[PDB]
Ligand binder design. Structure first.
Ligand SMILES: CC(C)n1nc(C(F)F)cc1C(=O)Nc1ccc([C@H]2[C@@H](O)CCCc3cncn32)c(-c2ccccc2)c1
Ligand SMILES: [Zn+2]
Lengths: 292, 213
């Protein structure tokens, strides 16, 4: 009964909302589960956005310590209040009569080319949202690093309340943040915590994906990723050169050991380039070297 | 009501010799509405000067659609001005030249028309040439001379002025007398980034090595 996650009962949701346990503890929600359809919708919307930022809402429910996201929709944003809330209310009213019973559980927005984290404005927005409508979660997607690394870059964060000082306990995996966004990442890094993200899909979705792979391998075998992202690598090289200049300036005198961070960024970019090249080498071996 | 109109017209001419075409056009319009309630023979000259200003600054764009402009434009007393405006809007050098040639004793006689007819002709020629060179990659200069109806030397002078003023993006091949338009460009930002990376690496390794002793 894998499909049991799709069954929605309103009585249990009302009981949980009226018996809110998240008002006592603060590190309560630590698991986020996203449907396959919702994740694909976010990825396609972010990619269609281009090099700009796109934001939408996230419908779903709660289950114990788990935030479940089922669907999504894109806000116009050409706007905080007014237009955004009008669109949210109208879309929810329209979708409630066709079978979509769940209400909002979060908001998502894209961070194209500078990682998955919450800025100062995002932290303030999340604080405002969690003050009034709870529970809530903020999903940040990097649509450009997804193509470059061949991995879905997504992060679901939840913001600590004002005046609360958690005692350390931060793993904080390394993120290659550009130079002009390093200061913003430093001041607001301990005001939120990340939720571990998992994905789920139904049985018909699984069967359809298995049947789709029988003909979707052609696109994998003819990707040629070295050309789809040629400006991203140039921007990365520019940022890396600036970081190298700053590390050299630090060396001439006398972050901590900025040379190590610049080296890590250079290694990441170079490894992505070599992966893109070896894919084409494999294609050349398979298809062009059958010279009869 | 003649002294203030005359002084306004004189101030308009002085501004016309000194640029700042917006305020000159406003002064010309003020003189025009002053002459509307004054002597008829000055009205045609004021209309001529107003049209001269309009085609000189090429941004006012005031055709005969004005409700007060129609009763004077439709008057057969002055008609070459409407043809000149039509030629300017249509950007036809041939029609402009035929209007200038046919309409003698009414355009040549006025000196203020003559002191700016060269500028108007140069403006329309430049616009026509800019439109002409749009699709081509390498284009002969005698071809441009045939189209614009000027000799090859004047075409080369016009092209030199346009290229210097960063208006035409191309270069003149003088030995074989053609013009090559710079339409072939590629992604040269990657090599600039690589050069910057190389320079930073050079300085950084110099400093790191110099750190020891
Ligand atoms: C849930 C949304 C509608 N929301 N609710 C409330 C609250 F007042 F209720 C408040 C909000 C709300 O608009 N937040 C917000 C803040 C900042 C940005 C942009 C902003 O800086 C300028 C761009 C740079 C940037 C990088 N990261 C966020 N941005 C956005 C935003 C994100 C994607 C597209 C368009 C706008 C949304
Ligand atoms: Zn943001």
């Amino acid at each position: 009964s894998i499909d049991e996650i799709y069954k929605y009962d309103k009585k249990q949701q009302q009981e949980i909302l009226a018996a809110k346990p998240w008002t006592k503890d603060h590190h309560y929600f630590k698991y986020c589960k996203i449907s396959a359809l919702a994740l694909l919708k976010m990825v396609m919307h972010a990619r269609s956005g281009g090099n700009l930022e796109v934001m939408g809402l996230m419908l779903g429910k709660v289950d114990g310590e788990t935030m479940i996201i089922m669907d999504s929709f894109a806000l116009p944003v050409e706007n905080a209040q007014a237009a955004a809330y009008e669109y949210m209310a109208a879309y929810i009213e329209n979708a409630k009569q066709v079978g979509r019973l769940e209400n909002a559980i979060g908001w998502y927005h894209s961070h194209p080319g500078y990682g998955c984290w919450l800025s100062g404005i995002d932290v303030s927005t999340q604080m405002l949202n969690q003050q009034f409508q709870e529970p809530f979660v903020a999903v940040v997607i990097d649509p450009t690093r997804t193509i470059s690394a061949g991995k879905v870059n997504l992060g679901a964060f939840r913001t600590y309340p004002k005046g609360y000082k958690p005692p350390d306990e931060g793993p904080s995996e390394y993120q290659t943040i550009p130079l002009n966004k390093i200061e913003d990442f430093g001041v607001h890094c301990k005001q939120y915590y990340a939720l571990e993200v998992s994905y789920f899909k139904s049985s018909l979705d699984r069967k359809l994906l298995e049947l789709l792979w029988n003909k979707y391998w052609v696109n994998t075998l003819s990707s040629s990723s070295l050309l789809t992202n040629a400006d991203y690598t140039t921007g990365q090289v520019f940022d890396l050169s600036e970081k190298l200049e700053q590390s050299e300036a630090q060396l001439g005198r006398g972050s901590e050991d900025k040379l190590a961070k610049a080296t890590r960024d250079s290694c990441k970019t170079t490894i992505e380039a070599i992966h893109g090249l070896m894919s084409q080498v494999i294609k050349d071996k398979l298809f062009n070297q059958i010279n009869i | 009501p003649l002294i203030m109109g005359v002084i306004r017209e004189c101030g308009g001419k002085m501004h016309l010799r000194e640029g700042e075409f917006e305020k000159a056009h406003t002064d010309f319009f003020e003189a025009f509405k002053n002459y509307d309630e004054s002597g008829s023979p000055r009205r045609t000259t004021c209309l001529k000067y107003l049209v001269l200003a309009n085609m000189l600054m090429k941004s006012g764009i005031n055709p005969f659609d004005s409700q007060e402009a129609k009763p004077y434009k439709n008057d057969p007393e002055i008609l070459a001005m409407t043809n000149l405006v039509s030629a300017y809007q249509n950007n036809d050098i041939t029609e402009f030249e035929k209007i200038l040639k046919t309409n003698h004793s009414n355009i040549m006689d006025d000196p203020f028309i003559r002191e700016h007819i060269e500028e108007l002709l140069r403006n329309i020629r430049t616009q026509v040439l800019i439109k002409l060179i749009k699709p081509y990659t390498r284009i002969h200069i005698p071809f441009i001379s045939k189209e614009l109806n000027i000799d090859v030397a004047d075409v080369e002078s016009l092209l030199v002025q346009c290229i210097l003023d960063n208006t035409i993006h191309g270069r003149i091949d003088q030995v074989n007398q053609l013009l090559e338009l710079d339409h072939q460009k590629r992604g040269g930002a990657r090599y600039t980034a690589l050069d910057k990376w190389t320079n930073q690496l050079n300085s950084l390794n110099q400093a790191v090595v110099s750190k020891l002793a």
